[PDB]
Amino acid sequence: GPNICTTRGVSSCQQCLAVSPMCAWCSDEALPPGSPRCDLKENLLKDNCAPESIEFPVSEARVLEDRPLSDKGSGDSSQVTQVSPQRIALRLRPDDSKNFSIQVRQVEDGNVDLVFLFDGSMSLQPDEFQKILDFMKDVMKKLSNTSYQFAAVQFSTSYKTEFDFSDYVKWKDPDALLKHVKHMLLLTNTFGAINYVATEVFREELGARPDATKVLIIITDGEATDSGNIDAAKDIIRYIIGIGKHFQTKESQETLHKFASKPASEFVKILDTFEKLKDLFTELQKKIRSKVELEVRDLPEELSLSFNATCLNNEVIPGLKSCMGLKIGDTVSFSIEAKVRGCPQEKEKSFTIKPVGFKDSLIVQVTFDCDCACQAQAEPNSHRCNNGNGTFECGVCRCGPGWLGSQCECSEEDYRPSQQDECSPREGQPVCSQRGECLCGQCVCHSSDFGKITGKYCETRELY
C-alpha cells in the first residue's frame, strides 16, 4: 500500500528523510530496482532490503541540566533555582516536533527596578503635586525591606532624575530623596520623558539591575505636548496613570494607550480625584509580581512554537505564556512542542527561555538530523552508475548533467517510463527489433561501425 512515502518518487535518502519524520530509507544496493527504497521500517524490511542498510534517524529529547526547584530556605548561596529545567538539548528530524515541559516557582521576593515618571504639568496645584510625591513616598515606605529598587523622574518641558536606584540603595529615605523636588511647572513632553527614562535612567552605572523586572509608573495630568515614539521603552513594563479634569472624555483617555504596555485594560488607569492615588497603588501592587510571563530570547526564525500551560490548580490552558495570581512557593508547568521548517545549515543553535524578571532561564540547544550517515562512503563517479556519470550514494545513484535513471543510463530525458512495454509494438514481439536496449521505457539503438540504426524500434538500419 503506497503511503506518503514511495508516492513521491524520491531519488535520494535525504529527500526520503525530508518528506516526513516517519519515513525511512533503504540502501541495500543489492536490492532489485523495482523495489521502492523510501517507505517505513516495519514495511521496507519485509521486502528484503537487508537489515541495517536502512537509515531511520529519530528526533529525540534529552535533558541536560535539571536543577530541582528551591525549597523555602533561600540562603542565596550559589543562587536559588526558580526554573526547572533550564538547559536541554534536542535533535530534530526534518520538520519534526517533540514535547517537553518546564516548571516555575518563585523562591524569592522578586526583584523590580521601579521608575516613577511623574508629571510637572503647569496644570497642577501645589497640593495635587504634593499628593503625587506622598503617593511615591507612600509606595516606597510600604516597600522598604523588599527586593524593590526605586528611581524617580520629574518631567515637564525638561526631564530630571530626582534620584536613581543607587541613591535609593544607600539612603532609603523617600522623604530625603524627594525633599529636593522643585516643581517644574511647564508643559508635558511625555514622549521625550519616556525615551529619557529608557536610556538614561535604566543604567547599570546608576544602580540598575540587569535581570530585574523593569517597571515604569507614569503619572500624568494631561495630554502630551510632544510627538514621536517610545521604541526604546519596548522592554519596560509601563503603567500609565491619567488624573483630573482633562481625562473626562473617554477619547482623551485613549491617548495614554500608546505610552502604556498592553493590554491597556490592565495598564491604563484613570482617576478623577487625586484622593484615589492612595488607594490606587494598593490595588495595582498585587498584580505586579503576581504573574510570571515567559520571555523567549535569541530564538531561531525557523522554529514553530506551540504551547500548553498549567497554573493555579491543574488547569489546562493551551498556548498560554503566563500564569497569573501566584504567590511565593507556588509551582506551575508549561508544555511546549517545537516544530522546525526545512533542514537549516548551522545545525547547532542556542536560544533562551526566561521568565520576565528572573536570573534563571531555560536555554535549549538544538541540532538537526537531515543527512543520512551513509552520505560518507559516497563514491563519486561510481562504476555502478553508468561508469563515472553519476554518484552512487547510499545504495542509490543520483546523476550528473544529462544522464538519468537507476544508474545514469537514460541520458535522453524521456519522461517517466510508465509501462515498460512501450519499447515493443505487441505482446509477443521482442523489444525493438533486437537492435536496441529498452531504457526508461524507450529504445536506444545499437552502435556498430558497419551501420547506423534509426527508428522508434531500432528497425531501420542505414549503413556505410
Residues found near ligand NAG in the complex (CB under 6 A): 144-145, 306-308, 318-319, 335, 337
Choice from 12, 27, 103, 121 touching Mg ion (CB under 5 A)? 121
Nearest Cα neighbor of 107 from 379, 292, 283 is 292
Does residue 123 belong to the site contacting Mg ion (CB under 5 A)? yes
Residue with smaller CB distance to Mg ion, 165 or 274: 274
174 lines the binding site for Mg ion (CB under 5 A): no
Which stretch in 213-221, 230-238, 261-269, 412-420 sits in contact with Mg ion by CB under 5 A? 213-221
Least distance in angstroms from the C-beta of 380 to ligand NAG: 43
12 vs 123 by CB, closer to Mg ion: 123
Query: Which option in ligand NAG, Mg ion, none does residue 318 bind, with CB closer than 5 to 8 A by kind?
Result: ligand NAG
- Binds 123: which of Mg ion, ligand NAG, none (CB < 5-8 Å by kind): Mg ion
Return the one option of ligand NAG, Mg ion, none that residue 145 interacts with (CB less than 5 to 8 A, by type).
ligand NAG
| Partner whose binding site includes residue 144, from Mg ion, ligand NAG, none (CB under 5 to 8 Å by kind) | ligand NAG
Q: Which is nearer to ligand NAG, 145 or 265 (CB)?
A: 145
Q: Which stretch binds Mg ion (CB under 5 A): 121-129, 292-300, 306-314, 387-395?
A: 121-129
Task: Tell me the C-alpha distance between 103 and 413, whole Å.
Answer: 58
Q: From Mg ion, ligand NAG, none, which one binds at residue 221 (CB under 5 to 8 Å depending on kind)?
A: Mg ion
**d(C-alpha 280, C-alpha 276), whole Å:** 6
- When asked if residue 53 is in the footprint of Mg ion (CB under 5 A), the reply is no
Q: Which residues contact residue 401 at a Cβ distance below 8 angstroms, ignoring those fewer than 6 apart?
A: none
**Smallest gap, in angstroms, from Cβ of residue 302 to ligand NAG?**
17
The residue among 219 and 338 lying less far from Mg ion, judged by its C-beta, is: 219
Cβ proximity to Mg ion, 69 vs 270, nearer residue: 270
Pairing mode of beta strands 303-306, 331-340: antiparallel
Q: Per CB under 5 A, does 222 bind Mg ion?
A: yes
The count of residues interacting with Mg ion (CB under 5 A) is 4
The yes or no reply on residue 156 touching Mg ion (CB under 5 A) is no
- What, of Mg ion, ligand NAG, none, does residue 121 touch, CB below 5 to 8 Å by kind? Mg ion
Q: How far is the CB of 145 from ligand NAG (least distance, A)?
A: 4
Q: Which is nearer to ligand NAG, 144 or 199 (CB)?
A: 144
Residue 221 makes contact with Mg ion by CB under 5 A: yes
Element (H or E) spanning 39, and its range?
strand 38-39
143 or 271: CB nearest ligand NAG: 143
Do the Cβ atoms of 153 and 115 come closer than 8 Å?
Answer: yes
| Strand pairing class (268-271; 237-243) | parallel
Which range binds Mg ion by CB under 5 A, 117-125, 275-283, 364-372, 410-418? 117-125
Cell readout for 399 is 546523476
**Smallest separation, CB 5 to ligand NAG (Å):** 24
Q: How far apart are CA 453 and CA 404, in angstroms?
A: 22
Contact 17, 5 (CB under 8 A): no
d(CA 430, CA 23): 39
What gap in Å lies between CA 172 and CA 165, rounded to an integer?
A: 10
CA distance 379 to 153: 71
DSSP state of 387: T
Give the orientation angle of helix 126-142 with respect to helix 276-284, to 10 degrees. 30
Binds 335: which of Mg ion, ligand NAG, none (CB < 5-8 Å by kind): ligand NAG
Calculate the alpha carbon distances from 76 to 80, 146, 196, 328 in Å. Answer: 6, 15, 34, 15
Q: Is the four-CA dihedral 320, 322, 325, 327 of positive or negative sign?
A: positive
Among residues 144 and 367, whose Cβ is nearest to ligand NAG?
A: 144
Rounded distance, CA 334 to CA 320, Å? 8
Q: Of all residues in this chain, which one has the CB nearest to ligand NAG in the complex?
A: 306
Residue 31 half-sphere exposure toward CB, CA atoms < 13 A: 26
Question: Binding partner of residue 71 among Mg ion, ligand NAG, none, CB under 5 to 8 Å per kind?
Answer: none
CB of 136 to ligand NAG, least distance (A): 18
Q: Is residue 442 close enough to count as binding Mg ion by CB under 5 A?
A: no
The item of ligand NAG, Mg ion, none sharing an interface with residue 255, based on CB under 5 to 8 Å by kind, is none
State how far the Cα of 140 lies from the Cα of 61, in Å rounded to an integer.
46
Peptide linkage before 85 cis (omega within 30 of 0): yes
Residue 399: how many CA atoms within 13 Å on its side-chain side?
18
Regarding 120 and contact with Mg ion (CB under 5 A), the answer is no
Q: Which is nearer to Mg ion, 221 or 409 (CB)?
A: 221
Q: Which residues of 387-420 are buried (b: 16+ CB within 10 A; e: fewer)?
A: eebbbbbbbbbbbbeebbbbbbbbbeeeeeeeee
- Give residues in contact with Mg ion (CB under 5 A): 121, 123, 221-222
